[model samples]
Target: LTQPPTITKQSAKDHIVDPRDNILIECEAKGNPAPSFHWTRNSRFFNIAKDPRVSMRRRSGTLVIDFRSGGRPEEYEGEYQCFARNKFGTALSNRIRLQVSKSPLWPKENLDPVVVQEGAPLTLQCNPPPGLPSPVIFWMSSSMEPITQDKRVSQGHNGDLYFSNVMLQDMQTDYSCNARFHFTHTIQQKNPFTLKVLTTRGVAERTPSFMYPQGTASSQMVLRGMDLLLECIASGVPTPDIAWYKKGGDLPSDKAKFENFNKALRITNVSEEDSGEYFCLASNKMGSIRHTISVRVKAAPYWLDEPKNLILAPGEDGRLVCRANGNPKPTVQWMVNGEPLQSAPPNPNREVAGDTIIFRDTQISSRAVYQCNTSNEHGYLLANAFVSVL
Candidate 1:
């Protein structure tokens, strides 16, 4: 019984070579009955019978080809393959794609660079040749103290090193990235990237700190089903990025009904459910700080039920008031012709009648559309009444 011939290519995959170099493909095989060999490419057969450029030698069951020809696009370029056949069977080696480029140039060697500011986020990216796989990356900082614990430095998706938030103490350090390959005969190349953090008093060095609204006597107000604004002021060496986060770890924008301002989160209309501890987070590269305030919402006024023909006489005083209940006392404002009415200090004529808005010696212009706005934590409520001046 004769075993089938098994032919194999010496090279694993496509190879990169220069035109000036001689291209030799070794096709080796072993079989009991001794296999016949032939090589052809592009549907054309190699004429071992007559061609001088193509010569074959058999040594110890190994078939070698010495195809000596000038490296011109017309003569020596294209696909080439080898096949072997015996009485038992035939086996062909895998095809190898060969590239014939001009004289090879020195390979480009580049190392990934990294830039990191002390007390800020740091990321270092490493990229090697295309055909080569990702190389192992090692990081070491010169600073005496270990910048961060091993767990803090994470390997990213694309062979990148990510430091969540660096501290100022991480400055004055020398960092390096090293790569190792599979087919390395010599020591794998080492590409090093260094990070120099400047210790200047600029904004980059500013630490993050939060400051709450400072006022022992803060004015408290009720918010009914109306718009309400809360303001918080924070100061730092470098103004930090202001953000509002809820106790539930959600931002104001996460809510469909709530609106957001630079430093304020606006609830379109306050409701009992909207009452909670609200806080602001101020963050910078250095650090982060927070300030919190308790908020309570309530219901609107009662007497504000659609009133009719509310009148303010030219000589006598008149008033329109709507009272509502809420956790915080609701504020009252009156708008006429889209402008707020200002009162003359010590105008003995007009007076505040309970929660009513009073007007003295009203003129015809004052007879325009009149509306009373009341707001608390729950939100704002408006009552409209037409006034005729006589």
Candidate 2:
């Protein structure tokens, strides 16, 4: 038995033309016992010794087409056959179809580098020329391990490389992808890519304090139809600006009778209408602080005895009013001897009247000392009153 010699085709795919492209057709063959090779067109043998456009060469049992410029689709259109015959048997390469094509297979746009923030997910996509099929994908990095199908490194559907939650160390890495074709023996072309990662931090841990001598303000009583004065002192390292506001979006203006100190607040001709919540806002470039207070105006209680000290009867149904001021209005509830007073539900026997604590015919149960506690977005305050029913 004799071994059969094999004749194979090489070079890129044959080109087809419409009188537009300068074309070249190439075929390759390998054989043992030194087979004789020749080229044929249609039914005629090509005599390259006289033809300038047709030239051939032999290198290591491989046949190559040196020159063949084809013009016009009809001028060079035909089936090309290369045959090799030796002592074993005559083998002919499969007929190759040649045509001239004018279009090139390269993209016009150049790839650019990409940037991402550290600790963020990142993805890089590579696209080959549309005219090419099945391009090979590749990747590389400067630090850490090379990109592979390992954890954290994922291969996407379209052959893109993805790094999930990339760390700072992953930045400044180099990556690349390549395309390879089997036309001229292991032909490969590469495209390179680079990565840059960025990072930054802003603000944290803010604090503010009361600048007044007293830590906080719990209660301030004013006779009806009289002026009232209340002050809140607060400061922050950043030196925030201060402003005061009334409930329902009203602001204090210079023209208003209220004289607003740089750090304190005042109300002119106090009325029951002003017995609502008030807020102090302090802010700077960095951030802001808000303090709130509740004010109550009473109808000239029994008598305006003194500006600082006011006396009340023990069991004669006395009333102690409290007003809160801050970002959130301070909660007002009567505390009797450290315990909250549960006012009776209904007392048809007596009348009830007051903003917070109402007394229906004072009793020993309602004679305990009571306290007022106010709070808001910025801080809190507590005030106390004593009573006796004998």
Candidate 3:
């Protein structure tokens, strides 16, 4: 009579598998040549019959484990025992606790796509992936709907997603993150991320406008050596700072001849003192706007008054007043001794309009030289007069 084993029905409690599941542990003892069983973990002795994902059976005392080849949830999770021996000797089995849950690996570069600006303040981080029982994150909205937190939106206990100000309707919303696996309730989703809010509203609702010299800010006709560009296309919000003054002074960068590049006002070689009135201010911090352009510099044509000696009396009736001032307005010719009244030969007592030259019936061919020629493309002016037939 060898009575020493005793252990009534073990595998007492704890166990929570989830990683390719399957793990069993049982024990029952009664002594005297009917015992034999062994297995231990966290208390050593682990050679469950050469361990091919463990399996022991001393006549059904059972231990079995096939957790997909070696149960690795960080080294096969804790405590597990079972040891009932023969010849009236050992018996131990009541401790069992081997939890290994895992379901949280959704990170393909955090699902890529995020840009923020309007009223700025944003954070979105739902980075899971790292197994074992610690997952319960929230936040979802790509129609899976469930993102309720409040007061400018918020949700953070490691699954961060908070925006204190970002608006533009939150840029149409689209977000995702759901870890949940507090012991295998299983749910791991994360693959939808998008939020791009960048709105100055096209310079915030318009204020300073003019898009490249298309007339009517009053006036502009530049052509004296050419090259004058005054473009001031201003909008609003927080981007409007263009300044260029002229009649109000301060727009001369010494020999480079004026180039205030902000909204462009470049004038090089255009002279006549570069005509007048140019002011195109356009400020910002949310205010100021002004536009006035009147630049007329098409020079070349002098002699406001130069044509004096004339005294006809033979058949008298004379008048040769050639007062010039150009920009295309000077062409009066009645040359008598140097030919060229438009190549002569039509003198029924000469006549020509514009800069005036009329001698209805003066004889002696209206007597000699009288020239007044003015031109535009910026060059040409000649005035001379001398007629005498008294």
Candidate 4:
């Protein structure tokens, strides 16, 4: 059966890319009959086919930037997002961005050998170089191959490499630390580390601990009747199995979707009932950890009843009313001929309620325009109807 496009992959929020390197922003979606792609930069939307520096791959919907000579650095740096479409409908992606910066070399230095016995913990430091926006650090083998993170060893937030328990195979290859300076579009490598892991056990078994969240929010607001998305990323020994659930209750089966190694949860067509506390739990043989998030649903003002134009005879009783509804309960007010409606001694025949105007005994002066204003914190509306006396 044909279905509307659903975003399978989302572009990252912010990035530090080098002007000298070709930047690639990624987004993907799945749907019947396949989906086409487009992009928005800052506030402008344009066809990428007509543009020279940017292009999209038909199959994967990956965006490639031409850092070649003509690609303007200023134009490439800003907020960006992608869209995927098909004959049935279109799907929009989240807003993402990039900034450019240059980095300078670090003071030359070398570290002492790090020796640890098998089954012992080890942490290698990353002394990164200085740069505009500050360079991000990573690890690579002395032979130029990048280290593959796993349940046993991984990279920390501060750029250190963590090993829950050193293994005998770790000593087979040495490691090197590097910093990425996007402005210069170059990577600076530090001196190689002399790592030694003994075959014999040197320490007792340790409990697993949470590395950190990928980038989860503590609280968020979702528009009523819209979808909700939450993400969680935690690392520990045994890679920590990730699970999701509502904090006070179980997640509704039909509406909840899981993806990205169970690191993300997306709830479809959320209403007030879906608003509450939610959390992700991560556990392993050693220990368990968890993170929590709060959700709130908001609504915009919408019309429940509207004011209509009328033609009435003079001295004939008449009435006008307007009504609206919203999450905060919209308020209604009235005005006549651009002036606030009132009933003072000057106009003893005219009566005004919050939402309605009552004319006990009409006159020629009653043949004036009446306006209704309905509003709430989220939205506003104005409607005017003309009245004529016969």
Best by lDDT: 4
Q: Flag regions of model 2 displaced more than 4 Å.
A: 1-50, 53-64, 67-79, 82-93, 97-113, 117-120, 129-136, 141-149, 155-159, 179-192, 198-390
Q: What is the overall TM-score of model 2 with all chains considered together?
A: 0.28
Candidate 4 on 263-359: residue-level lDDT in tens? 5688998888999999887666677667778898886666777876565676788777788877777888665543455642257777767777777
Displacement of residue 250 (Cα, Å) in model 4 is: 3.8
Estimate candidate 2's RMSD in Å. Answer: 42.3
Pitting candidate 1 against candidate 2, the one with the higher TM-score is 1
Candidate 2 lDDT: 0.49
Question: Model 3, clash count?
Answer: 0
lDDT of 3 at 14: 63
The C-alpha lDDT values of all candidates are: 0.50, 0.49, 0.63, 0.70
RMSD of 3: 45.7
Clashes of 1: 22
Model 2, range 1-390, lDDT digits (tens) per residue? 223344455433244433322344555545446656676766588665765555565642233332335423445557665655555344444455665433234455576777766545566665555323344445655333355544344443345665534556665457765444333223233355667777644222235444432344355656556666554443443434556777785644542343323445666666666777777665544566666676776552222111111133544655566665433345454444334446533334233233355555666433333455454443334444544445
Cα-based TM-score, every candidate: 0.34, 0.28, 0.24, 0.43
The lowest-lDDT stretch of 10 consecutive residues in candidate 2 is 301-310
- Screening candidate 3 with a backbone cut-off below 3 angstroms (N, C-alpha, C), the clashing residue pairs are none
Order of the predicted models by lDDT, top scorer first? 4, 3, 1, 2
> Model 3 over residues 126-242: C-alpha lDDT tens digits?
768876657877878878877665534555445666564466776666888888887677888888779888875442333434333333376778776777776654434344566
Evaluation by TM-score, superior candidate among 1 and 3? 1
